[PDB]
Amino acid sequence: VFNATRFASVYAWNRKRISNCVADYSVLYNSASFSTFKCYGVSPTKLNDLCFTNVYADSFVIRGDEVRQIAPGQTGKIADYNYKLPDDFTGCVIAWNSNNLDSKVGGNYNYRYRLFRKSNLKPFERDISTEIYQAGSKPCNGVEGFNCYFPLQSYGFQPTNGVGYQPYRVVVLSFELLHAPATVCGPKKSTNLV
Amino acid sequence: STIEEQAKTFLDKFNHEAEDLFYQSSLASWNYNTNITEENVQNMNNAGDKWSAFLKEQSTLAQMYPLQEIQNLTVKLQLQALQQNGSSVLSEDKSKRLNTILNTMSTIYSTGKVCNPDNPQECLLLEPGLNEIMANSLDYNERLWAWESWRSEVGKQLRPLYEEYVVLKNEMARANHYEDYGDYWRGDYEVNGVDGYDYSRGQLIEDVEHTFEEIKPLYEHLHAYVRAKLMNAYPSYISPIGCLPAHLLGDMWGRFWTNLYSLTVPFGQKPNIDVTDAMVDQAWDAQRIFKEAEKFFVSVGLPNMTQGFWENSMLTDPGNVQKAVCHPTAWDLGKGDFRILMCTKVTMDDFLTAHHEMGHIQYDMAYAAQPFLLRNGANEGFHEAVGEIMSLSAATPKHLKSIGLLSPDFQEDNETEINFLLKQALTIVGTLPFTYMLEKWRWMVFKGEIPKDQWMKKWWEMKREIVGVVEPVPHDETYCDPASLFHVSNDYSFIRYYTRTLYQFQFQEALCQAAKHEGPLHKCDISNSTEAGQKLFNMLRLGKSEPWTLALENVVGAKNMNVRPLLNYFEPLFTWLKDQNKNSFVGWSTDWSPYAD
Structure with a gap:
């Protein structure tokens, strides 16, 4: 998910489940192959000492300025209408600038996102509908216009984009401590046999 | 639910689409200026035509949102740019005729030429020849022929073309609820719907009129000095009490006295500041000049430039096969991308010009976070005025001494200061009443008070x-x-120079006070004053989302143009010009002409 060949859109964010394995979390921290890395509640180097029930990786690409919206208690076009996190988000977020990989002359139109929605999303909710955002009482008849707007739009990921507009491969790591027994934990140290 | 969502959603839709469409035209223009080719100029025109068509179609929904009962200024300013029809109000025949007139006037002006009576085979074009005749050549005959024949060859032919230009334009303006195309230009500073900061269109005519008489005490003293100095060069044509001939001003249009410095040298035996040899001695290049220029912008406290800024910028002309436009031009390619085109050389002339272009980028990069329709300047003055204040401080010897270009042993006195100060007044003081003169005349022509026969x-x-x-x-x-x-021929507004000139000293005095500089402003230097850049960036970031008067109230202490900091900059100059006219007449007498007999 950190180095996937192709990523999903923001409003159509994909998810990958992690369980039944050993997960070394200190690798990415010491890799220095990222643009931003911040964990909520737990330090990134302490995660190897914790075991969890289920861990998901929500992958998508955004602009640089939109990275501030992915956090607990934020709001905006992406936080509200595309991908929302709960106020109790105790996960982690990794970002990596992919302008040399995902950017395209004319803009990568395959990565799109929602600008308007009739209602705000829930935590970890996904909506890939094409319903026209209706502002007035008149019907849109499936076409934008006066008080009607097509909510989905494409990104301008061009090579000449700045820090705030270039593409950034982002992955959100949500942890879950349920009543069920654990399924994934960090690696334990070892030494020679005396 | 409410109607406001239609405007908020429409502008957001326009701000998303117009942002990418405009940068395609802006980036296409970058490619042309960097490589002048038939393929680049074609895509440049096609991209501009593409974004132009998008602006017209988007005016349909913009007009369906009446701003009569709307208080949100952000929604009002953005829609008003699209609600205006402009040239689309008239039929295609009237609009096509206007472009045909402007295309003809530009060709007649650009291809204008004057030739001597004694050498019909040897003569020059408008540029670069006839400019040097009024600027460099000191012959009374060559300057007179270049002025008079230009008025007959180019001035007469443009008279019937200017009539259709004024008539057709007034119909376009009047259709958009204006009095005339003069009022259309004055609407750039228009403000409404904001208490304590509104501004009428007719206020500009009163401001230039009030500030003009405030400039007269300084201009009348310099005019007698320039007349007295030129009288010694042309005593058989210039009276000590009369007027200055029009062909001895220094250019083909009578706007600047910058070329008359050689004839008006205050102290021809005193030195001046020039770090051209200093830069060549220290092995400076076009890159180091821009890099060392950036040191000044961070010292004052303004943001720094990015890596792609310098790496993708132009510093020279890449060969004749791919010749680029060497003119200084600050570009905003978009998406956080900014660049400058300049063929920089190792000399003090390009040292200050580099700071001027970097000052323009500080303007655009500040309000880059605003919406696309508001990602522009509040008016014409703020755009170019902010660029001059940064280059003027760098020209101060205090900054050159700090960086290490001008030696610290360079002595300074009132004498050497007057040569630099008086030379500037030839550009500032010798141009301010001319812009008020020309625009007042043009504004009367658009309104229609002056008949066409009485031009x-x-x-x-x-x-x-x-x-x-x-x-x-x-x-x-x-x-x-x-x-x-x-x-005039290319359909531009020249009043911005009058507003830019006064606004330049307004912002300068505000930042000089921020730097705690005492005394006249011509010795001011904001170098190594972090508070100065911070005070400026608070004004640059506003863009055009707030009234331009509010930018002045919180910075320069006024709401309109003012002449107070003009005297502060030229404070010791007024005493100097007060002395030199003891053998001349302050002001002028309208009864004298060079052809009098």
């Missing part, structure tokens, strides 16, 4: 009264002098 008649009247200039040969009703100007 040259009233133009000669305004010249003797306002500026105190007289033609070398009398002109009849068939001539039209201001029509031969670049800005």
Whole structure:
């Protein structure tokens, strides 16, 4: 998910489940192959000492300025209408600038996102509908216009984009401590046999 | 639910689409100026035509949102840019005729030429030849021929073309609820719907009129000095009490006295500041000049430039096969991408010009976070005025001494200061009443108070009264002098120079106070004053989301143009010009002409 060949859109964010394995979390921290890395509640180097029930990786690409919206208690076009996190988000977020990989002359139109929605999303909710955002009482008849707007739009990921507009491969790591027994934990140290 | 969502959603839709479409035209223009080719100019025009068509179609929904009961200024300013029809109000025949007139006037002006009576085979074009005749050549005959024949060859032919330009434009303006195309230009500073910061269109005519008489005490003292100095060069044509001839001003249009410095040197035996040899001695290049220029912008406290800024910038002309436009131009390619085009050389002339272009980028990069329709300047003055204040501080010897270009042993006194200060007044003081003169004349032509037959008649009247200039040969009703100007023929507004000039000293005095500089402003230097850049960036970031008067109230202490900091900059100059006119006459006498007998 950190180095996937192709990523999903923001409003159509994909998810990958992690369980039944050993997960070394200190690798990415010491890799220095990222643009931003911040964990909520737990330090990134302490995660190897914790075991969890289920861990998901929500992958998508955004602009640089939109990275501030992915956090607990934020709001905006992406936080509200595309991908929302709960106020109790105790996960982690990794970002990596992919302008040399995902950017395209004319803009990568395959990565799109929602600008308007009739209602705000829930935590970890996904909506890939094409319903026209209706502002007035008149019907849109499936076409934008006066008080009607097509909510989905494409990104301008061009090579000449700045820090705030270039593409950034982002992955959100949500942890879950349920009543069920654990399924994934960090690696334990070892030494020679005396 | 409410109607406001239609405007918020429409502008957001436009701000998303127009942002990418405009940068395609802006980036296409970058490619042309970097490589002048038939393929680049074609895509440049196609991209501009593409974004132009998008602006017209988007005006449909923009007009369906009445702003009568709307208080949100952000929604009002953005829609008003699209609600205006502009040239689309008239039929295609009237609009096509306007472009045909402007295309013809630009060709007649650009391809204008004057040739000597004694050498019909040897003569020059408008550029670069005739510019040097008024600027460099000191011959009374060459300067007179270049002025008079230019008015007959180019001025007369542009008279009938300027009539259709004024008539067709007034129909376009009047359809958009204006009095005339003069009022259309004055609407750039228009403000409404904001208490304590509103601004009417007619206020600009009162401001330039009030500030003009405030400039007269300084201009009248310099005019007698320039007349007294030129009288010694041309005593058989210039009276000590009369007016200055129009062909001895220093250019083909009578706007700047910058070229008359050689004839008006205050102290021809004193030195001046020049770090051209200093830069060559220290092995400076075009890159180091821009890098060392960036050191000044961070020292004052403004943001730094990115890596792609310098790596993708132009510093010279890449060969003749791919010749680029060497003119200084600050570009905003978009998506956080900014660049500058300049063929920089190792000299003090390009040292200050680099700071001027970098000052422009500080303007655009500040309000880059605003919406696309509001990602522009509040008015014409704020755009170019902010660029001059940064280059003026760098020209101060205090900064050059700090960086290490000008040696610390360079002695400074009131004498050497007057040479630099008086030379500037030839550009500032010798141009301010001329812009007020020309725009007042044009504004009267658009309104229609001056008949078309009285253009040259009233133009000669305004010249003797306002500026105190007289033609070398009398002109009849068939001539039209201001029509031969670049800005007039190419449909531009020249009043921005008057507003930019006064706004330059307004912002300078505000930042000099931020730097705690005491005394006249010509010795001011904001280098290594972090608070100065912070005070500026608070004004640059506003863009055009707030009133331009509010930018002045919180920075320069006023709401309109003012002449107070003009005297502060030229404070010791007024005493100098007060002395030199003890053997001359302050002001001018309109009864004298060079062709008098």
